[PDB]
Amino acid sequence: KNTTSSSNENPILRWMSIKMNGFQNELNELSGHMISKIIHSQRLILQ
Amino acid sequence: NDVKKSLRGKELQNYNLLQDCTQEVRQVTQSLFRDAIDRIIKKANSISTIPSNNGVTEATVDTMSRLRKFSEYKNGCLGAMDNITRENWLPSNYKEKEYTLQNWEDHNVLLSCFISDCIDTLAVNLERKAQIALMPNQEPDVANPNSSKNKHKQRIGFFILMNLTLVEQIVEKSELNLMLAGEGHSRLERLKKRYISYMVSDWRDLTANLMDSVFIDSSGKKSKDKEQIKEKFRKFNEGFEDLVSKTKQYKLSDPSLKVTLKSEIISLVMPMYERFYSRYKDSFKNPRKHIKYTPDELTTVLNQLVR
Amino acid sequence: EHIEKFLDGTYQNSIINEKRKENILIGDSNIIESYQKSLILKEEQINEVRLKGEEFITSVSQNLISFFTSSQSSLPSSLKDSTGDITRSNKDSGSPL
Numbered sequence: 182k183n184t185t186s187s188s189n190e191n192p193i194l195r196w197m198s199i200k201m202n203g204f205q206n207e208l209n210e211l212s213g214h215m216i217s218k219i220i221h222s223q224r225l226i227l228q
Numbered sequence: 229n230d231v232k233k234s235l236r237g238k239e240l241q242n243y244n245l246l247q248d249c250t251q252e253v254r255q256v257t258q259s260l261f262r263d264a265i266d267r268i269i270k271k272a273n274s275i276s277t278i279p280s281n282n283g284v285t286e287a288t289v290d291t292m293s294r295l296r297k298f299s300e301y302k303n304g305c306l307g308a309m310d311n312i313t314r315e316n317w318l319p320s321n322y323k324e325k326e327y328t329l330q331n332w333e334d335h336n337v338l339l340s341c342f343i344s345d346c347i348d349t350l351a352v353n354l355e356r357k358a359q360i361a362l363m364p365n366q367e368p369d370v371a372n373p374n375s376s377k378n379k380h381k382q383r384i385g386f387f388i389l390m391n392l393t394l395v396e397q398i399v400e401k402s403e404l405n406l407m408l409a410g411e412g413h414s415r416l417e418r419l420k421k422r423y424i425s426y427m428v429s430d431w432r433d434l435t436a437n438l439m440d441s442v443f444i445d446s447s448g449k450k451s452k453d454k455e456q457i458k459e460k461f462r463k464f465n466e467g468f469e470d471l472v473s474k475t476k477q478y479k480l481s482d483p484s485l486k487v488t489l490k491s492e493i494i495s496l497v498m499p500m501y502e503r504f505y506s507r508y509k510d511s512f513k514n515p516r517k518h519i520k521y522t523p524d525e526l527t528t529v530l531n532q533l534v535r
Numbered sequence: 536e537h538i539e540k541f542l543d544g545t546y547q548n549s550i551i552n553e554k555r556k557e558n559i560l561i562g563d564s565n566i567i568e569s570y571q572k573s574l575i576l577k578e579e580q581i582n583e584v585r586l587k588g589e590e591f592i593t594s595v596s597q598n599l600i601s602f603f604t605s606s607q608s609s610l611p612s613s614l615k616d617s618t619g620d621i622t623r624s625n626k627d628s629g630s631p632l
Contacts (some may be wrong), residue, residue, distance in 0.1 A: 189541065191570040193582065196538045200585050204592055211596050213615065222610045222632070281545045286554065293558040392547075398555060479540050481548065535536050 229307040257308045261342065265349050267294070269319075272353040278361055282322040282387055284394050292398040293349060295343065299403040309335035314345065325371055327351045328418035329526075340412035343404060347395055351419055354391055381426035385450070388423045392416070393481050416454035420468040424489055426477075431493050434467040439500050442507075450511070455517070457511055460504075461519045475533055484499040490534045497530075498523065542579055568628065603628035 185191060232246055260448040268291060275285045298305065317398060327348045331337045352370060359368035369377055378384065399405050423461045451457045480486045501523055509515055521529075537544075544561065550570060556563040595616065600608040605620050606628045623629060 187571045187573050189546075189573045190578070192571075193538065193541075193543065196585065200589060203589055207589075207592055207596060211593070211599075215599075218632075219610050222608075224606060226610070237614055281543060281547055283545060283550060286551075291555060293556055293561075293563075296558055313598075392557070394551070398558070479544065 231303065241393050242377075250436070254308065254310060254312065258312060258316055263286075264294075264298075264346055265317045265319070267291070268349045268353055275357070275360065278358060278383075278387055282390075283385070284391050285354075285487065288354070288391050288394055289487055293347070295404060296402055298343070299407070302403060302450065309338040309342070312338070314341065319343070319533075328415040332362075334350035336409075339409060341416075342409040343408050344412040344415040347416070348419065350391070350395070351388070351422075355384070356386055358387060365437070366394070370378065373422060373424060373429055378426075381429040382474060382478065383392065385423040385503065386480075389420060389427075389485060390481065392420060392423075393485075411454050424485075424492060425469075426495055427489060428493055430474075431471055431496055433501055434464065434471060437467075438464050440503070442504060451508070454511070457508065457518050461533055463506075465520050472529065474535060478535075490530065494527075494530055498527070501526065538582070542574065542582065600631045603631035 186193075190197065230249075232243065233307070233332070252346075271287050271290065272285075274287055277286070301308075310458070325343055329345060355370055356368045358380070359366070359370070359378070362384070363378070366377065369375060372378075373381070376380070399408070438460060439455075445453065445456045480489070482488075501521075505519070505521075505523060508517065512518060547614070550567070553567070554565050555564075573579075580617050598616065599612055602609060602612055604619070604620055605618055609618070
């Protein structure tokens, strides 16, 4: 139309871009703590 | 108003006829106010079903924007409140328990009196329509949180309190806002607390037969009848998660209603489980396998029952 | 919670917002292409499909902490799910992690 949308995809880019923030943030956080934990595994097993 | 006030201490002789055709324009107020109440009756009873997502019939929108058409004739409303009864807008076979109303002094009395009585008429007619439309074979019994009849006190409660959500969210910025001071706020509060208590009803069943389940086995010993342990505590968990389950059907709109129903039902439940949990938490090495919640975690459940 | 609470989640009360007429004034001329109806033709299933995106991504996320790392250093186990070497005994490690 566009609209793009009908709130609910513009305002569910409040979902979609922010579900992309839950996803990109999820990879961010798991990336962080996983990276530092494995860093504390070469610390914790090797070192 | 301008002419009967105009300048006095003088001969004024059509003033009687001013009071007579002005007595007919207070039959235009009077007829417009019995028209207001009967307007609520017929214009409300127009609809027959609670809505799809159970919202608000826009006959109520008509009723409140109808009231803001009663708003900005304000000073003519003030003089228009002259010398006329509460029963000059009443279908006389009513009861006053229908009306959250608890003087005869000025027109500011009949201001909040009259308009808040009109929203009481909105309450009784909407309430009646729900009482019909859910149990279509029964007598509509009204204003009754202690009803032994309704099965939809939560549902009717959220319906009606969305209607009042509308009503105070037009008295939000109205002149009625600045008109109906003092009592009429508290009239609206009692109006709320009815349907609030409808949404506390089966929680009062849970607490009711919980502490009754304390009462009937308050006779003998410690619970070697461990069917009483898992009776009170299991069935308490059963009805508790039933109530949390049917709490999920409704999602509130006033934040102060969230605070209201929240702290109401917290204050309903908690001390029972405090003295009762803490009374009977001495029965196993794992009460866990019989008794589930703390008051801490149950409190937390209630505090995220209200997202 | 809110995003599920807009699908059926009224989203008609939002239509009731301007369908208070914004009175005053008198109209009541609400001709919004109402609204965001919406989504019942599979875009609701696109929404729940995205939610499967989320809980799925958490499922593979913490499911990466199922291997310990399979017993041992597969430590950089960032990707991906395989290799069920089932030497369950012993410590070093069922741990994960």
